[PDB]
Symmetry: D2
Subunit: 238 residues, 4 copies
């Protein structure tokens, strides 16, 4: 079998992705930060529906903890086949009012996590010679920019550049590297929500299960020639 | 059941897409232009593997013929749920050496086909109230441009713009409209001297061509019910070219 | 000196581009289709301000007339240094209501013009060994798609693909090929009910239309000697739409 | 009487941009990090050619120093009209071999500098009511990714997203915010073995590096009054790479 780490699997998109990939037959690393209950609830649903997984935990902003836990997991269970770097946060404010923490927490958590979580998985993935899948979670605001979120937009755009650069390095190793950029998904400021809606031709939010379908496609064996892409799932926003 | 028209289903990507969507449980309009044998061979494989379809035929550059055949098909069998506008051609030459026929055949066939094939399907799709799927075939050269193919690049980029504009009009009708942009795929369309193949590979990080079945997997994803929030997208399947 | 053909110079963006490039010191081919008065007015302002130009005329949808007039002009005056393929039209309607003429007039005029106008200018440009500039006019709707204009979006996206492909062919010849994609610009082309204008503005962060002179400033930059490393680009001038 | 801060003005692109904008008549904040001599050399050339500027210094990765120096400069001289956030570095290595410092130094310097340098300038720019210009330096590798530079690609892409988001916030304040993405430019930053240079050229249709002055011409255009409708753009100057 083939295992896939899913960060932020305790809720929302991460939970949905974990469920779907488990159903597809992947053994899931159900990761959480602090919500261990949510994580167990996710794993319970996975087991109930006939699939396999296990809990693990770390702060994606904590480089050393990430390396510790992942090296241990890999030693005990073998290399991951897939990594879904889904975990992330927002700390919105107009650019001039943005606090040091607002900026740093978003950059360290959303962008540094690429290095912190994915780096420890790469050589083992290569060593196992099964090929692989890497999927990152960006955002429409990473693609187009969004008022009130210069920090989030920056981090999410940075994830896109990281994803593309890595895709080139790992192509010859049969590891695809792609990024999913959701629009507004049902999991902020009522003012900003209204503006966001003004731009969705489909006039609805997406569901987490929809994002998971795309992840499923990208994880699948038939998607091995798709790499270096940002694929947006956003109701037509752009 | 739900039917999907697939143009250029007599070979290559169209054939592969037809096969895959049939396996997914769609009833396939296996379209061809002149290669009726190829079309039947595609339908035979569909039936052999437990699915349904039927042949139909038209020149996608021929507006009247497209409207005649499609109106007839729709009257007899009901609205298409899906349309995969896959058919296309190339007539390569450096821009200054490009003949009138080289330009017109590529624009009329690859770009005018959007209007000719898809227009007659829209109101019926809307009328049936099942929602829908529209998928066009562009190309990496439509996204980035490609030397020796100003005509192909133009037509294929034009398909992208058409697709996006239509996606906006039909979003509130639960019809998604997306475009697949393959890179280099191993079919009869590509005929390359070993020298030019080597150079082409130098630009593909995966150092291989794609297979038609791979393109079909993406079409399958886009056709699926879970992909109903994906619209207005160009999705590239190209081994990392860009 | 160096001459630049500007199509659709009888009004709007073309007129503004003609004026600006004349001021920059280029000798302007002030082209028009039917509005000869507008064209002469444009040339009068050019001469009044101490620059040079001359009138010429053709239907950019008429391949033969384009080739005839351009070959003649080139024989008499030498190769163009620059070509600004600016002329274009819109025939909007929802996709299912779009007439044959709506589709064809837009594709033939906006997209076929690339071939019809620019092809005859290429070998001579190369032959003259001065390098060169080619600038096409697309649109924000060619980049993103726009509801009510599947035809315009298609043509304008096709111009982008053509531009990019050509840019690659001509890079070694010191001829840059770029595309300008304006957003909403205040000209006769735009006729909008106050209700629709308000909505349009809601999507422009700068809450105003652009002026033709603004589009001309970008053309001016791209035409300039310092812009010789910029090629294969679509540059949008749209008040922040995207 | 309009001043523009140019970070990394002690050499390369920053030097070239400083020179050009000085010639355009802007009063230049010639910033440096450690190379004070280079910075003075830049200012000497500015003064020699009839323009104005002054030196200032800070580590763009040092938030508190940036705020201290910039608040002081703004108190003494008034708000900047323009900010060109040009300074940056690379620490290349294959992703699995990338050290903590390789990653952090590039993210902190190239991406955190957006916040560190530009935030202190914004309210004052708004308060002065002259409108304004913000220009950031990304890179082709920020747009497409580049092997050996996951860190640089990430930072440079992040600059793009920052730029675009800020452009939306400041549009109504008549401050444009754009990003320049150069391809390969001939400076001290590029240090390449002849073998790797040849390969790099294979991917540039113009088969040459750009010059810093070329990047400066584009900055000049964006700084100009006629470019007030251009905002939220990434404009690539790369010899046709993409
Ligand atoms: N919702 C949208 O509209 C939308 C749109 C575009 C992109 N996205 C992106 O998609 C991803 C998921 O979105 P979502 O709506 O599912 O978010 P969500 O429901 O708020 O869940 C966020 C997850 O991230 C985890 N997390 C927070 N801080 C962390 C840290 N320091 N280390 C590790 N994990 C941490 C949380 O952990 P615990 O709760 O387990 O402690 C939680 O599982 C995010 O990266 C988001 O930026 C969302
Ligand atoms: N192969 C690639 O590398 C590649 C890359 C990017 C995009 N694409 C695109 O993918 C699509 C399929 O290409 P392919 O490689 O599968 O090509 P192919 O094997 O040459 O298939 C061509 C198909 O298009 C049909 N066709 C051609 N002219 C037609 C007309 N005037 N009216 C109706 N149908 C017509 C053909 O019908 P008959 O055989 O019955 O004559 C045939 O089924 C094309 O649009 C192409 O531009 C291909
Ligand atoms: N205005 C906008 O909001 C906007 C936005 C994005 C893009 N654009 C593009 O900008 C370019 C110029 O726009 P504009 O607003 O200045 O247009 P305009 O004022 O409506 O002028 C149209 C120009 O194109 C010429 N023309 C029209 N049909 C022609 C044909 N068949 N053959 C030759 N010439 C023809 C006209 O010649 P006569 O005067 O001789 O008839 C006229 O000079 C167009 O390509 C347009 O698509 C405009
Ligand atoms: N060269 C290229 O091919 C290329 C291509 C794409 C993008 N770019 C981007 O263009 C910009 C300029 O590049 P360039 O090639 O001119 O680079 P360069 O010759 O290496 O010049 C670098 C400048 O950035 C400054 N700098 C570096 N670290 C700093 C810090 N911590 N705080 C403040 N200033 C710092 C340097 O200051 P001191 O010398 O005074 O220490 C110097 O003035 C960079 O952002 C670069 O990434 C360059």
């Amino acid at each position: 079998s083939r295992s896939v780490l899913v960060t932020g699997a305790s809720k929302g998109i991460g939970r949905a992705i974990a469920r779907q990939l488990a159903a597809d037959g992947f053994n899931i690393g159900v990761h959480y930060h602090r919500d261990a209950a949510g994580a167990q609830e996710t794993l319970n649903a996975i087991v109930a529906n006939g699939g396999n997984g296990r809990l693990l935990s770390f702060d994606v902003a904590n480089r050393e903890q990430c390396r510790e836990v992942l090296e241990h997991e890999i030693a005990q269970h073998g290399a991951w086949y897939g990594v879904v770097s889904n975990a992330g946060i927002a700390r919105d404010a107009a650019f001039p009012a943005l606090s040091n923490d607002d900026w740093d927490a978003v950059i360290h958590t959303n962008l540094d996590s690429f290095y912190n979580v994915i780096q420890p998985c790469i050589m083992p993935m290569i060593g196992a010679r099964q090929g692989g899948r890497i999927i990152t979670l960006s955002s429409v605001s990473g693609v187009m920019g969004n008022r009130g979120q210069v920090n989030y937009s920056a981090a999410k755009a940075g994830i896109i550049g990281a994803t593309k650069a890595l895709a080139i390095e790992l192509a010859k190793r049969k590891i695809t590297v792609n990024c999913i950029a959701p629009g507004l998904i049902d999991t902020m400021e009522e003012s900003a929500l209204k503006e966001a809606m003004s731009m969705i031709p489909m006039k609805r939010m997406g569901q987490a299960e929809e994002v998971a379908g795309l992840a499923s496609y990208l994880m699948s064996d038939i998607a091995g020639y798709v790499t270096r892409q940002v694929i947006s799932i956003n109701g037509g926003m752009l």
